[PDB]
Amino acid sequence: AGAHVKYRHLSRSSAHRQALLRNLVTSLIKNETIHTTYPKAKEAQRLAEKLITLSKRDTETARRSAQGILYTPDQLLPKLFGEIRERYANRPGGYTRVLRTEPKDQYSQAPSAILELVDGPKDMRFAMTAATVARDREQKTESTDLTKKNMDKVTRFRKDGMRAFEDMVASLRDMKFTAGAINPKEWKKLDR
Amino acid sequence: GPRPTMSGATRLVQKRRHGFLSRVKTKNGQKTLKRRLAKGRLRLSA
Amino acid sequence: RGMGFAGGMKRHGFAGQEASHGNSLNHRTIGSVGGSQGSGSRVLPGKKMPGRMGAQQHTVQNLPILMVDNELGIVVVKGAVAGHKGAVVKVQDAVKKAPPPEEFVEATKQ
């Protein structure tokens, strides 16, 4: 009868909700990736992008605001205002990426997603595009406009860009990661 | 209704009140044994 | 404005029942739904009950136009209008009023 909800309450109390989001962002900056539900990945995203904006700011207030979101500031503040600040110094927003996956827990079947930091060491979309380009060059296939588009997305703001992307494709072909991949030209002749 | 009348029940009272010796040593207890023995009970007491 | 499933108080203005003088789980309930066997042994059609509210057409008549600006493209009318911001509304001359002067109907057409 009242107002529409401002945000997801995630079937939790106020204190629990705030703590849960702080943990999701504390593990994201510590591990650069987290595999959780889609609703939690989307709520922790808005708090993670606002925490990375605090690192870019040079005020003392920004440093106290970041200390009040992380759960181990003594260990993660150097990384926040260090490596991460340098990474997203030229990126105007959109510092995170949510990608849907299969249910992390088969009992619940709850829709799940991966929340990653773009241009990070564990960027999933950067590795999926390299595996595609690896399968193309190994099968003499022409990359689609959607593969080339993603190739520019994951190499525009990166430190070295294309160089770091070609080494991934080369290493994936060195270990035969694309062994057993079905050629796209044989997809229409498969019912299973 | 039924009540939890066996709460805090000690096994010392079971032997005193329903034990074998409470019966072989009394006139009315010899009947219980003889009755329970005629029926074929294995548990004559306690 | 839509309001989803509404009770009997918001939808039909029912007063509700007591709050503390013994009331048992029936503070915002609708009470009796009708009479007994003599009344039909049924709930009569048109009985006011909970249900969805809002998200329906509504007309407000006899609203003057205070300002008319072509550049901004706005037509300021007195009073309130149904719906949310950004929703499309229909504006037409009042039916319960006399049509605008003949000179105006011709000037605009001209």
Partner: protein, 57 residues
């Protein structure tokens, strides 16, 4: 319940519009060729790539 529900009416409640809907939003993984869900990541490539980035680095 005043009476037992007949076989006709209980079958109506269980089958009228309760048919399990087929999943047609299926495409194939680009680097894998395996069938995945639309707009979702390949579960086979995820675990593999997620494990490949743990050894090299």
């Amino acid at each position: 319940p005043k009476k037992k529900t007949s076989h006709m009416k209980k079958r109506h409640r269980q089958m009228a519009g309760k048919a399990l809907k087929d999943v047609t939003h299926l495409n194939r993984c680009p680097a894998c060729g395996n069938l995945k869900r639309m707009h979702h990541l390949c579960s086979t490539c995820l675990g593999k790539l997620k494990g490949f980035m743990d050894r090299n680095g």
